């Protein structure tokens, strides 16, 4: 909005602002390691100790 | 121990390990959390790397 | 969780698999890829060997000129360097071996092969040693000739590669950021008026561009030649030759350790996760 | 094994350049290992430096190449080049080269002009120029042409009565192709690394000129005194004085063997010098859709 004045200033006629904001897209990557020599036995069933 | 006829302004940097106090208002930003998706890398000689 | 729920695709099986249909396409479950290397097995004389040296050492086979010999011994650059010192770091070299006689007479001609300066095409690199039985006669060794280093047995242990630090020269430390992903390891022959030498080069650059920087480094060694000698019977214009031993990971750098004999101490550059690939000899 | 290497930008890529980066999809870009600068060839080939095409050759040969397939704002996805995988490469470069030859592929610096491989990026303080992709015979011919030009333009500049500067720029000039002749971009000073390459080449040259097999001299003298071959057109029925004065001796065979031995070894060393820059072996370049399966040799 604006403010009417008594004196004659160059009056601002209903200014309308449109701003936009973009997304700061950024990601996270972790690093797990696993050795495969014990991964064949997780799908199977145990019978020997 | 004599004057060389030349004066020397001597600058110097200084790293200060300060601790900063952050303040933000309530609910200014909004986070969007994706779902964690897995992928595989090169299999090393000891292990595979997820 | 949803990580365990998305785990079914990323569990195993490089490539993928069409789970059902009119036909089954692709089977790679219960095999996590990681191509196993082929093994170059050799049978050497036990008198040509030292048992006390560690497993991951880059070897060098000299191919036998003799037809009536099923066996063939090997050279390591320690053994090779003390063989140059016998044909004509030394205090390290005598500490290992007692008698260079059977090694010098093992090759039929050694002063002749340096006289014609054709020592490079008779030494075929077989990469780092891994597997080693111990016998008093006809000892059998096995080296990972091409691919990743691994033990033979079902415990498939990584084998760190021991290259001697005093015989190794860094490239980038003497040059003082193109590609820090690839880390390649080169061995280089080097002639001299005193006695020849084998040296090693770590490089993070590519294979084909590495020789031109090696000439720039190597130029003070070639400025000393030709001032005191001039080749007749024409040979000797070649001054060393380089080849590729393979690559290793630059994410884990080389960590210096201590390969000790009982006599004294000897530092060594350890190469872990080495991917062996013997290429051809490139002269300078 | 992983190939997907994502690279973030740092600021908002403007929508005028997302269209041309949509147009440049499937091209090749040089890596640095992430960051934004150096992911391309602007850091070693700028406007300020005279383009030597050898230091940027050092950077592209020394670094693993990378395919650019997806561009988004504030994030773009790259894919490295690791030996053993057969990459899909599209020939999307304005100096057109059909791969009817289906030979081995080669990468080269942007010697066909700055404009054809550049892209402006007013988001950050980074500009990207692209490496040129082109077949093996054209690449080695343009390589020997740019070396011969940077070694002979300097000696034409060394001439005091340099009446003909435009002689080599129109005889050497363009590139040899049956479809068209495509004019290239020419430096005036060779730069340091180019003279280093000519230094090692001249070292090999003066080492190999000390051994010439003398029987071959007799053969070219006899063929000149036979019918003038179409391959012999460069002599136009003339024996040079130098080959006439190095044939004062006779024909032997004992020195010929060791001569040829050192010639094989030094020509293989020269080939190792000229097999510089990363190379691609091609299986079945598809013509109708301009894509090629290629793996790193």
Tokens of D134: 């082109």
Say how many C-beta atoms besides its own lie within 10 A of residue C164's C-beta: 21
Tokens of D162: 């340099």
Tokens of D75: 């994030």
Q: Taking Cα atoms as reference points, which of D101, D124, D104, D105 lies closest to residue D42?
A: D124
**CA angle (C125 as vertex; C119, C128 as ends), nearest 5:** 145
Angle between helices D192-208 and D55-62 (to 10 degrees): 80
Rounded CA gap, D42 and D28, in Å?
A: 14
Does the beta-carbon distance from A22 to D6 stay under 8 Å?
no
Whether chain B has a CB inside 8 Å of the CB on D83: the answer is no
Method used experimentally:
cryo-EM
Chains interfacing with A (3 or more CB pairs < 8 Å): B, C, D
Whether chain D has a CB inside 8 Å of the CB on B44: the answer is no
Cα distances from A47 to residues A37, C30, D153, in angstroms, run: 18, 19, 81
Residue B42: list chain D partners with CB under 8 A: 1-2
Rounded CA gap, D59 and D158, in Å?
A: 30
SS3 D75: strand
For tokens 């066909």, what's the residue? D112
Does the beta-carbon distance from C150 to B45 stay under 8 Å?
yes
Residue in chain C nearest A34 by alpha carbon = C11
Whether chain C has a CB inside 8 Å of the CB on D265: the answer is yes
Determine contact, residues C63/C108, Cβ cutoff 8 Å.
no
Q: Which residues contact C11 (CB under 8 A, 6 or more apart)?
A: A39
Tokens of D55: 């230091």
Rounded CA gap, C283 and C33, in Å?
A: 37
SS3 C160: coil
Whether chain D has a CB inside 8 Å of the CB on C178: the answer is yes
Name beta bridge partners: D134: D106
Exposure on the CB side of residue A38, measured as CA atoms within 13 A: 5
DSSP secondary structure code for residue C78 in this structure? H
Strand pairing category for D118-119 and C255-258: unpaired
CA dihedral D188, D191, D196, D198 (to 10 degrees): -10
Rounded CA gap, A17 and A1, in Å?
A: 11
DSSP secondary structure code for residue D231 in this structure? G
Residue A26: list chain D partners with CB under 8 A: 8
Chains interfacing with C (3 or more CB pairs < 8 Å): A, B, D
Name beta bridge partners: C203: C184
Does the beta-carbon distance from C32 to A39 stay under 8 Å?
yes
Q: Taking Cα atoms as reference points, which of D268, D207, D274 lies closest to residue C236?
A: D207
Determine contact, residues D54/D46, Cβ cutoff 8 Å.
no
Say how many C-beta atoms besides its own lie within 10 A of residue C213's C-beta: 18
Chains interfacing with B (3 or more CB pairs < 8 Å): A, C, D
Q: Which residues contact A45 (CB under 8 A, 6 or more apart)?
A: none
By Cβ distance, the residue of B32, B34, B48 closest to A36 is: B48
Strand pairing category for C139-148 and C38-44: antiparallel
**Centroid of chain to Cα A1:** 33
């Amino acid at each position: 909005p604006t403010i009417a004045h008594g004196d004659g200033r160059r009056p601002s006629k209903q200014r309308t602002f449109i701003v936009v904001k973009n997304c700061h897209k950024h990601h996270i990557s972790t690093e797990m390691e696993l050795s495969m020599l014990d991964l064949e036995i997780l799908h199977s069933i145990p019978e020997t100790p | 121990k004599i004057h060389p006829g030349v004066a020397m302004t001597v600058v110097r940097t200084d790293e200060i390990l300060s601790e900063n106090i952050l303040f933000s208002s309530r609910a200014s930003t909004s986070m969007f959390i994706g779902t964690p998706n897995v992928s595989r890398r090169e299999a090393r000689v000891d292990a595979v790397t997820f | 969780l949803s990580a365990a729920a998305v785990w079914r695709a990323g569990l195993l099986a490089p490539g993928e698999v069409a789970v059902a249909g009119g036909g089954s396409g692709g089977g790679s479950f219960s095999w996590s890829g990681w191509r196993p290397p082929v093994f170059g097995d050799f049978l050497i004389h036990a008198s040509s060997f030292n048992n006390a040296e560690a497993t991951g050492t880059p070897l060098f086979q000299f191919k036998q000129s003799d037809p009536f010999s099923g066996v063939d011994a090997v050279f390591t650059p320690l053994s090779l360097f003390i063989l140059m010192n016998h044909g004509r770091l030394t205090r390290m070299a005598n500490l290992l071996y007692d008698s260079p006689a059977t090694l010098a007479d093992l090759v039929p001609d050694f002063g002749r092969l340096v006289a014609d300066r054709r020592f490079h095409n008779f030494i075929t690199p077989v990469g780092p040693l891994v597997e080693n039985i111990k016998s008093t006669y006809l000892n059998k060794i096995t080296t990972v000739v091409h691919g990743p280093v691994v033990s033979k047995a079902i415990p498939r242990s990584t084998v760190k590669v021991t290259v001697p630090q005093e015989a190794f020269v860094d490239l980038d430390a003497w040059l003082s950021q193109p590609c820090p992903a690839d880390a390649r390891l080169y061995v280089a022959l080097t002639y001299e008026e005193a006695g020849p030498r084998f040296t090693f080069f770590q490089s993070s650059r590519g294979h084909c561009q590495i020789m031109n920087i090696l000439r720039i480094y190597y130029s003070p060694s070639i400025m000393h030649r030709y001032a005191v000698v001039q080749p007749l019977h024409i040979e000797e214009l070649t001054f060393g030759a380089v080849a590729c031993l393979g690559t290793f990971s630059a994410t884990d750098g080389w960590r210096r350790s201590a390969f000790n004999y009982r006599g004294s101490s000897l530092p060594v550059v350890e190469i872990d996760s080495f991917y062996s690939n013997v290429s051809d000899w490139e002269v300078i | 094994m992983d190939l997907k290497v994502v690279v973030s930008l740092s600021s908002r890529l403007y929508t005028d350049e997302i269209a041309k980066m949509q147009q440049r999809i499937g091209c090749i870009l040089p890596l640095a290992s992430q960051n934004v600068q150096g992911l391309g060839l602007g850091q070693v080939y700028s406007l300020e430096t005279v383009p030597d095409y050898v230091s940027m050759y050092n950077y592209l040969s020394d670094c693993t190449l990378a395919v650019l397939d997806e561009v988004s704002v504030d994030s773009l996805i790259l894919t490295k080049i690791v030996p053993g995988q057969t990459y899909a490469i599209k020939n999307k470069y304005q100096p057109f080269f059909q791969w009817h030859g289906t030979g081995s592929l080669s990468v080269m610096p942007p010697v066909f002009g700055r404009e054809h491989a550049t892209v402006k990026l007013e988001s950050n303080d980074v500009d990207i120029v692209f490496p040129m992709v082109l077949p093996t015979p054209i690449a080695e011919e343009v390589l020997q042409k740019i070396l011969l030009f940077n070694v002979y333009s300097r000696v034409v500049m060394q001439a005091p009565g340099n009446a003909d500067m435009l002689d080599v720029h129109m005889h050497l000039g363009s590139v040899s192709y049956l479809g068209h002749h495509y004019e290239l971009a020419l430096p005036e000073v060779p730069g340091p690394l180019g003279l280093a390459l000519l230094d090692n080449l001249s070292l090999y040259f003066c080492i190999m000129v000390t051994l010439l097999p003398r029987a071959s001299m007799r053969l070219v003298r006899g063929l000149i005194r036979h019918e003038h071959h179409d391959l012999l057109n460069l002599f136009q029925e003339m024996v040079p004085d130098e080959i006439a004065r190095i044939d004062l001796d006779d024909l032997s065979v004992a020195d010929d063997l060791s001569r040829m031995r050192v010639m094989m070894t030094y020509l293989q060393s020269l080939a190792s010098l000229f097999n510089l820059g990363p190379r691609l072996a091609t299986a079945a370049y598809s013509q109708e859709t301009l894509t090629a399966t290629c793996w790193l040799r």
